């Protein structure tokens, strides 16, 4: 069972008055644990999972100081990007940053990432080796030269392979009761008659954790994609996920169809029949 820790940062400029709207969120796998919102009253990195509330005032002061420096970096980046792209002060623009680390089943370093977008387009990303940069355009190429000269990749590689992994291992232990628990999908099938000759079979997966899952339909033991509809996995709002897959079938032939469920919480894939 692989694990990840990721942080997501969004800054949106507010033309006309004041500093950008800055939102930062932290995740361990599919569980949000921290947040910072510049529009909020506290002006603190805030807890969003019970297991992070175990952290003392030193943790919260440290995360708050760092997150505020992240907000100021993005405010400066929005100004810099506006100049690189020769844009006016009239429009609102967005900078997004995402970084973090993945650990494998051994809770040891597997992958590190640090990427940036401007107005929803790739700008600059640290490559898989954590040694080089992918600059999407000439504006990003200028940032790449600056960061190579200042040995940014090396300092990032140290956090990504080191610090990031140590925090994840700590969070995984402290939040064991939920973070290390897998919630297998609760499955069922619904049937809806469209007409006297056509029916819809819907296969539901509910209350599962992690969000990663596969729902497939088979007809007579063979994979069926034609006449199938699959919704995007969605949050239930209690920390679990939901998904469904439907197939349109000729009325009376429902028994040829089987729904197949794959999930980390299931030792063996599940088969459902009407």
């Amino acid at each position: 069972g692989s694990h990840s820790m990721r942080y997501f940062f969004t800054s949106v400029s507010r033309p006309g008055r004041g500093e950008p709207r800055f939102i930062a969120v932290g995740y361990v796998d599919d569980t949000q644990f921290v947040r910072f919102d510049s529009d909020a009253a506290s002006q603190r990195m805030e807890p969003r999972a019970p297991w992070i509330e175990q952290e003392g005032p030193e943790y919260w002061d440290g995360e708050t100081r760092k997150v505020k420096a992240h907000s100021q970096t993005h405010r400066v980046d929005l100004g810099t990007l506006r100049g690189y792209y020769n844009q006016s002060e009239a429009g609102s623009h967005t900078v997004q940053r995402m970084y973090g680390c993945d650990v494998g089943s051994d809770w040891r370093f597997l992958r590190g990432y640090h990427q940036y977008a401007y107005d929803g387009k790739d700008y600059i990303a640290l490559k898989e080796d954590l040694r080089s940069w992918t600059a999407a355009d000439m504006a990003a190429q200028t940032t790449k030269h600056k960061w190579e000269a200042a040995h940014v990749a090396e300092q990032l590689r140290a956090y990504l392979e080191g610090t990031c992994v140590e925090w994840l291992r700590r969070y995984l232990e402290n939040g064991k009761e939920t973070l290390q628990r897998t919630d297998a999908p609760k499955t069922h099938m619904t049937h809806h008659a469209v007409s006297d000759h056509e029916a819809t079979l819907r296969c539901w997966a509910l209350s599962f954790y992690p969000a990663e899952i596969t729902l497939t339909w088979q007809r007579d033991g063979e994979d069926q994609t034609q006449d199938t509809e699959l919704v995007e996995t969605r949050p239930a709002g209690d920390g679990t996920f939901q998904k469904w897959v439907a197939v349109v079938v000729p009325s009376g032939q429902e028994q040829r169809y089987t729904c197949h469920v794959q999930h980390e919480g299931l030792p063996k894939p599940l088969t459902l029949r009407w």
Partner: peptide, 9 residues
């Protein structure tokens, strides 16, 4: 825990 070193673009 977040990155302690932020670099401008």
């Amino acid at each position: 825990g977040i990155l302690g070193l932020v670099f401008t673009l």
